[PDB]
Amino acid sequence: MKITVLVGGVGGARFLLGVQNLLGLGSFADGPSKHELTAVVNIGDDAWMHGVRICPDLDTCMYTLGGGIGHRNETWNAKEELAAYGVLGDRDLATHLVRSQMLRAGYPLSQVTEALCKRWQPGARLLPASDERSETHVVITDPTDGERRAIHFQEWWVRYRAKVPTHSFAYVGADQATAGPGVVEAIGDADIVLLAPSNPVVSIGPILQIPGIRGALRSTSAPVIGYSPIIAGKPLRGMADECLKVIGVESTSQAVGEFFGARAGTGLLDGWLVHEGDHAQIEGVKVKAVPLLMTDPEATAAMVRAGLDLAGVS
Amino acid sequence: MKITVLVGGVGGARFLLGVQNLLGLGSFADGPSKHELTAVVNIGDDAWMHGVRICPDLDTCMYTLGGGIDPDRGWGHRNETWNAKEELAAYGVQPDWFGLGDRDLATHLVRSQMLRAGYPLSQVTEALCKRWQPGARLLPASDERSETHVVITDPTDGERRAIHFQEWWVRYRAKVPTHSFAYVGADQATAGPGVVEAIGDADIVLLAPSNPVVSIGPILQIPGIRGALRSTSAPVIGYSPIIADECLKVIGVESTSQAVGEFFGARAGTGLLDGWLVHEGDHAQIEGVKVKAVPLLMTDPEATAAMVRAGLDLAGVS
């Protein structure tokens, strides 16, 4: 009755909704449930900004599973004034103010998250991958002086991506971080561990740079089942993932599967799901093609079922 | 050439509008500015709230002189929304009684980020004023902490507690048994950059008709500021706030121009005033202080411009 999922980005949050739909959790509950879902949540996008601590992946899971997905009725008047001062919705800022106060009074991020969830009641345990800072950065050639300069991922994404040469990612602080409370336990004790179809480099990937988490994944007796984020069939055949490009990995199910690789070798996957019509073959890894479009929590629920079935879990 | 005004509250800001209009400064400018205006701004109401630093008197002056103030309220931003406040309420946090508007929050966010990065309040204020262009130099009375505290009897339990001015004024509206004010940090607070110099080098110093106990009084508790006032060569002219009642009660001062004037007292003795302006039809007689009754209603920037002219004329300054 124990599922743990590694997640980041909007697609991680939508994947969790499907897990809840399958298992009758949170907004999809009728009578209080038998199963428990644990999300190990990317912190690589987290940043101190305008004096406040912003945790995007934790907030997106929390709002999404809490029914508040940014927000509804959102205004950006504070954001407007900030631009007028020459430098983030109004409701969003409330979350940031409360979190920053708890962090400055010594609550770890895992406890901060738990406190915020009393109000959102997401119906899942949302564990930060670490309580220490581990901030994804991007090394660019800065055009002002031609220097290789490390930029926070959120600034790269909005300002520099596709406009300057981009060389690599750096996980600033990962080496000094430890797995957050309960993370290693959630991975070791699960009936099954799922890699949600998030960006492999900057949503799942940074979770894997936190000392201890890759070890737990390699050694856990739980089946580890990954979901491909590559969807073929779009108009003009889609576009390559920009973050995979930075590390020179093609935007294919085959290439992302080898990125995680096989637990039987030195990698992370027992199972790899690809979208219908797609193909991959990876020694030691059971690959299966099934619908992987998160149209709605009901279609995501079928996706989660395919992962359980592939892993032989009830 | 040089005017220094001590200010606190909405009335301080409006008095500063009167000065600018008289002298062609800020939004009232038409042609080259001949004068410079410096405000020494109370910091006694400043509080940390929800992790950000609120400086109400500095913001009231900045917003008013820069055209962003709310007219109905006299504090905070115009065209304000309260979505972040409502959301704070939905999280069930305290304090739930201080109004932190969305637009106003940006000011507090920038200020707090700068203060925590090591910038002193005077430079933060200068940074924020690059956007508002108030047309006056807004000097925090101190860059250090000096906060007004209130000793009350708590109604929940009949115990004596001390609370910040903000809880007294906004949360209880002073409807609680109140026994004394305490200027915590005043004795340890150095006069802020430029403050003593602006008082020493002024052609005239004006005491705005702000709250005498909680707006002008706290500035006087900063040890260097009161000293500069006693020794500056400039005439010091005060404006009666009586034409606030709770604050005078707590300290046992009657609510009259004569009494408030004596609260500040005469420079000739141990006081601070050279002169004292009261509303027309008011008589006040204080030894060593030239008193003149003139219209003292800050109806509009040139009603006040005329109030300022009467102050210069009482001082004999041109």
Ligand SMILES: C=C(OP(=O)(O)OC[C@@H](O)[C@@H](O)[C@@H](O)Cn1c2nc(=O)[nH]c(=O)c-2cc2ccc(O)cc21)C(=O)O
């Ligand atoms: C009357 C005089 O003094 P003064 O006008 O400062 O009174 C206190 C108040 O204005 C100020 O200290 C502050 O409290 C005003 N003020 C609020 N006042 C309220 O009553 N309720 C509120 O929610 C509220 C929120 C708020 C937020 C930011 C801010 O910068 C000021 C704010 C005078 O000297 O002439």
Ligand SMILES: [Ca+2]
């Ligand atoms: Ca509460």
Ligand SMILES: [Ca+2]
């Ligand atoms: Ca000091």
